[PDB]
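Appendix B: complex inputs.
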Amino acid sequence: TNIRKSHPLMKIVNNAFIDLPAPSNISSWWNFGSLLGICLILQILTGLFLAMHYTSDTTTAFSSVTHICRDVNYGWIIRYMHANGASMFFICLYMHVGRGLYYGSYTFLETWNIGVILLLTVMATAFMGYVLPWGQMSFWGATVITNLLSAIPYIGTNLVEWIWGGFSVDKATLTRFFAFHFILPFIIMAIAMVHLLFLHETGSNNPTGISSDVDKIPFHPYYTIKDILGALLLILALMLLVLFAPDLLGDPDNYTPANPLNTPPHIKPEWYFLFAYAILRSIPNKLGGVLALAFSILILALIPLLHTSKQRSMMFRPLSQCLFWALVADLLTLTWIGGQPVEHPYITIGQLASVLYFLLILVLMPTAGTIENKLLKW
Amino acid sequence: DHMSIDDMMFVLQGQWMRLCTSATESEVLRGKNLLRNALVSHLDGTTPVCEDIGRSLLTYGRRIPLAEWESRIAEVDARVVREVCSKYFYDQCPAVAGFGPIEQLPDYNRIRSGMFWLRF
Amino acid sequence: RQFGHLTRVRHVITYSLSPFEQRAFPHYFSKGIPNVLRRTRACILRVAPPFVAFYLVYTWGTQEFEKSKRKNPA
Amino acid sequence: RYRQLARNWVPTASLWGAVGAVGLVWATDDWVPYINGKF
Amino acid sequence: TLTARLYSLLFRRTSTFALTIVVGALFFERAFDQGADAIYEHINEGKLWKHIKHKY
Amino acid sequence: WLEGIRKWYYNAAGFNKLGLMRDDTIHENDDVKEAIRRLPENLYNDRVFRIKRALDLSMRQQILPKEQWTKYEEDKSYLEPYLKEVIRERKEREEWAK
Amino acid sequence: SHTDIKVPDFSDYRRPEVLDSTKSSKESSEAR
Amino acid sequence: TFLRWAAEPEHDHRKRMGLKMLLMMGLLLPLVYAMKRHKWSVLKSRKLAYRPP
Ligand SMILES: CCCCCCCCCCCCCCCCCC(=O)OC[C@H](COP(=O)([O-])OCC(O)COP(=O)([O-])OC[C@@H](COC(=O)CCCCCCCCCCCCCCCCC)OC(=O)CCCCCCCCCCCCCCCCC)OC(=O)CCCCCCCCCCCCCCCCC
Ligand SMILES: CCCCC/C=C/C/C=C/CCCCCCCC(=O)O[C@H](COC(=O)CCCCCCCCCCCCCCC)COP(=O)(O)OCC[N+](C)(C)C
Ligand SMILES: CCCCCCCC/C=C/CCCCCCCC(=O)O[C@H](COC(=O)CCCCCCCCCCC)COP(=O)(O)OCCN
Ligand SMILES: CCCCCCCC/C=C/CCCCCCCC(=O)O[C@H](COC(=O)CCCCCCCCCCC)COP(=O)(O)OCCN
Ligand SMILES: CCCCCCCC/C=C\CCCCCCCC(=O)O[C@H](COC(=O)CCCCCCCCCCC)COP(=O)(O)OCCN
Ligand code: HEM
Ligand code: HEM
Ligand SMILES: CCCCCCCCCCCCO[C@@H]1O[C@H](CO)[C@@H](O[C@H]2O[C@H](CO)[C@@H](O)[C@H](O)[C@H]2O)[C@H](O)[C@H]1O
Ligand SMILES: CC1=NC2=C(COCC2)C(=O)[C@@H]1c1ccc(Oc2ccc(OC(F)(F)F)cc2)cc1
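Resulting structure:
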């Protein structure tokens, strides 16, 4: 009969992206999945090009990057794209996770935990990529952060030294981070394949939170056009940065070569890790700060069990909605705090923001679910 | 069957498309012969013929001799079938009605994209 | 599961129109502006409050950092 | 009643706990004689 | 209408719709480049090397 | 009173604005699946419709006229009886298996 | 009877070229 | 001025592209948006009718 439905390869693509029954009513918040895919492809291409020109020796590395920006043809636009690209990826990631929380998409457990892993994996990737230029921030950032694994009792010191491949972040660390940074996106692609595979078992959630089988529509052309529109908007955004403001989201110390003898005035990681930096910095004790940092991320994995509401989505849950936006604003605050030096009043703002964060996820929004239930006579 | 609606629609539109773009001489000869037989054999006995007279005068304002019909059919060829079918079918918007377990009945947009071919 | 056995629905009539029979932007501002206002009034008391508080904690704490870096007469 | 009248995985998970202990200790490399007892 | 003239002439046959688009992209590339360029180089009168190079 | 708050909350929740009843919004676990499955033709098709309606409105970012909103007083728990019994049954099989 | 289904009024969404219920829409088909 | 150029030789080229990107997006964003509305018009317009016996 029809090739799109039969052929072993075309069937999959058809089932996945053409004839897939999508809900009628998914919002712009469902754009982010496709956009994340784009982010991922974007990084791989721009990445691949950069890697045809870059070197991972301590001595050559900083200059090889600037060489891309001065002497390689269009090397500049490629490089700034891959860097703003990384920001756009984390925006897409945090938007995507947002939708998960608000609309109760995390009920799709397998899909969700894969997703947590995607997040961790992209985090590792971007952490190691930022080291690759070998700027002041790159170097001192990578040093402080990797050192946290020293706080692991018994094995900490040994473990951090084995990661490094020596006694500090040095030649061997950079060369291995280059390697890891290259192969990780590949593994992200597969995990993402799987991420989708599980999603395709249930089909999508929607903003009502109510099953939508009585009103599905073929993906193509409704959602083909709509994803494209979204991708345009992503490109609009990406290029606004690259072409008007390429350095807006970065730190200038990363234009100053890495120098093991002179520590920068304020050490920060990239903005997309600032909320977690600020949680870590709130705890006096170093292993405490480590376990808090890890929990600020891994808690994502627990949120499924903390669901109390009889309704899936927050659409009809006013009290929960307020708390959700509280969490969002708190994360904006945690980010602000994490970009700030450890002084009054920020030390105390940070401590509070850190408390608020865990308080919301583990106690307040569970409760609210339940209060709402009673307000509805169930 | 509740599960064949899409497949059915696809093959059917494919037929319209094929006739618009690529109808063969031979199959047109066949279509001619079908319609020839249809017209002759329908007008058989007093009632069908009485109706033909009656309706014809209302619709064409006269009765059309069988021999006239035949010379208009003889006119039709591959090119004519292609050309005419394109006028009415190729890249035009259909009207659609379904009743029953029509859960699988192609979305209107998909139906409309089926009224042309990217290859032509 | 694909279109054909998603679910069981009885007695529902869907009427619609070709895109080529219709305007892309029916009454875009005359209906749309009011609708957007309606949409915003609906959510702002849930969404805006936190961001107000952010702006305030950020205003205050930025200026508390200002003050503490100055000298005071003593 | 009938779970608790399970708890038949307690002696099997005892033997699996020794597999976990002895397994981590083999993969990682004193008071076991001969093996490593004589470095 | 103009659009009618265009539809029947260019867009009905899909082979033709394609031929239209490649040819039009050609003239659009040249036109858009030339015009935007002139827009930039008037916004930045005097400041570009190509404006001052006559001096050396 | 308690009921004063509950009524305010109902209007805040806002599912009523899409012409849904409370029971339409319950998240479908296995128990709920089954309760739906035991619904009589009248009650089932009605639900099918209310949701078609709401979903189509969700798409448009629209609501109904106030005249058409589901009234706090008129919202019957159509599902509870079916569901209370599905759950009674489950609890029974649990009990038994210990 | 089913004969008392009448199709709702689409006036609001129609292209202006197709508003006239007493004119062929085929005049405007090439345009549209 | 020289120190800016030294740090970012691309300053002028980038700004030229910025202009061309803004222009193309001015075209493409309403265009594709229009395409979206067209396809979706089928759905936006649709009227629902429940008709049990
Ligand atoms: C006191 C003085 C000091 C002030 C401080 C105190 C603060 C007080 C005020 C309170 C402020 C906080 C509260 C937030 C606002 C209030 C609530 C509100 O937003 O109500 C909306 C409310 C939401 O509707 P709903 O139906 O309830 O729910 C929405 C649905 O879930 C889904 O809706 P849909 O499916 O119909 O899709 C449409 C939707 C789509 O929504 C989404 O997808 C969300 C995000 C995408 C935006 C929309 C798509 C356009 C693409 C944007 C990016 C492209 C490049 C442009 C440059 C980016 C700008 C930096 O668009 C929107 O809803 C627009 C809202 C986007 C807000 C983004 C927040 C800004 C970030 C700032 C971070 C802070 C740090 C600053 C640093 C600067 C940067 C380096 O409804 C409406 O307003 C109607 C929605 C339709 C849009 C109307 C027309 C707007 C045009 C949209 C495109 C442009 C948007 C702007 C994006 C970026 C601007 C910076
Ligand atoms: C030539 C060498 C290139 C090698 C790589 C392969 C590329 C493929 C094509 C390249 C050349 C450009 C010609 C484009 C062909 C025409 C498209 C087409 O034929 O099909 C359109 C799909 O494109 C749409 O939507 C388009 C809207 C979305 C935007 C996507 C456009 C793709 C741009 C092409 C990229 C060029 C690559 C340059 C690299 C150096 C269909 O749209 P409609 O359903 O409304 O039409 C209905 C059919 N009617 C009008 C004939 C009745
Ligand atoms: C380790 C991960 C940590 C946890 C993850 C936290 C996620 C970070 C947050 C990013 C934003 C996520 C978006 C959440 C989903 C959006 C829900 C939503 O749109 O709610 C709107 C109000 O919209 C609006 O008012 C839309 C305005 C959008 C506000 C911009 C967000 C600010 C970014 C802050 C960055 C740090 C009401 O919509 P509904 O209830 O669907 O009702 C629609 C109308 N009937
Ligand atoms: C497999 C093919 C992939 C192609 C992807 C298709 C892109 C679809 C969307 C396009 C967005 C429209 C806006 C683009 C503006 C282009 C304007 C322009 O000509 O700018 C380019 C640079 O722009 C630019 O370089 C801007 C381009 C922005 C596109 C980025 C998104 C894709 C990421 C690529 C990463 C690997 C060069 O201008 P000039 O140097 O003056 O050259 C003169 C003309 N040759
Ligand atoms: C130790 C340090 C502390 C500092 C923390 C800073 C960060 C967060 C701060 C503040 C967020 C407060 C949000 C409260 C606003 C809620 C009340 C309100 O304005 O809107 C209610 C929503 O109802 C409802 O939602 C009912 C009211 C229930 C709201 C619960 C409040 C809890 C918020 C979290 C506080 C951390 C009414 O609005 P709608 O129902 O939308 O209808 C509008 C027309 N009446
Ligand atoms: C999730 C995908 C990826 C992310 C998030 C990512 C992130 C990053 C980040 C943040 C940087 C530092 C950018 C800077 O400020 O200079 C970077 C640099 C780099 N990345 Fe990636 N990257 C990804 C994929 C890839 C891939 C697949 C490759 C190569 C195959 C690659 C090659 C490079 C190279 C060579 C650099 C050094 C040049 C530079 O600094 O711009 N990246 N990456
Ligand atoms: C590389 C990163 C990721 C990619 C490429 C990706 C890809 C996608 C895609 C294509 C979809 C379907 C479209 C959509 O509904 O937005 C999707 C849905 C989903 N993803 Fe992700 N995702 C990523 C990360 C994550 C993360 C970090 C989480 C959670 C922590 C997550 C959880 C989900 C969930 C729950 C859905 C279903 C949403 C729904 O149907 O309502 N994903 N993802
Ligand atoms: C309000 C009382 C009246 C007199 C003081 C008026 C000044 C304004 C109030 C804050 C006083 C500053 O005194 C205090 O200093 C310490 C040290 O940096 C900071 O506080 C912090 O101290 C250490 C920082 O390493 C943390 O262990 C502790 O958990 C945290 O509270 C705050 O900034 C402030 O709580
Ligand atoms: C499948 C899918 N289901 C749903 C929605 C929306 O909700 C409904 C379900 C979607 O938006 C999507 C989707 C996802 C990706 C995409 O475009 C790609 C494809 C591949 C790609 O590279 C990669 F490495 F990932 F393979 C990068 C982008 C288009 C569409």
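Chain A has one domain: 1-378.
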